[PDB]
């Protein structure tokens, strides 16, 4: 991967035709996204009052 929607991500000295790519992602409130392939998730309820 070199560029994502006109955003510089890596250094490739060349761009090609955009192509769809299946990959997971997450956000932390920053500008750009963070894609991750291998990840371990865990669902916790915690009995919060907001729910």
């Amino acid at each position: 991967i070199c560029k994502i929607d006109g955003v510089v991500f890596n250094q490739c000295e060349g761009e090609s035709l955009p192509q769809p790519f299946d990959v997971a992602w997450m956000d932390v409130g920053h500008s750009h996204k963070i894609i991750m392939r291998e990840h371990k998730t865990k669902w916790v309820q915690e009995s919060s009052s907001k729910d």
């Binding site: 991967i1 070199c2 560029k3 929607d5 790519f21 997450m26 894609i35 669902w43 919060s48």
Partner: peptide
Amino acid sequence: GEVVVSYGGMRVRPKCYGFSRMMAT
């Protein structure tokens, strides 16, 4: 409930979690 994901030994609490497509080079 809420979901917590670990990546590279570090536990992070993201804002949104989903799997979709994206245009890339």
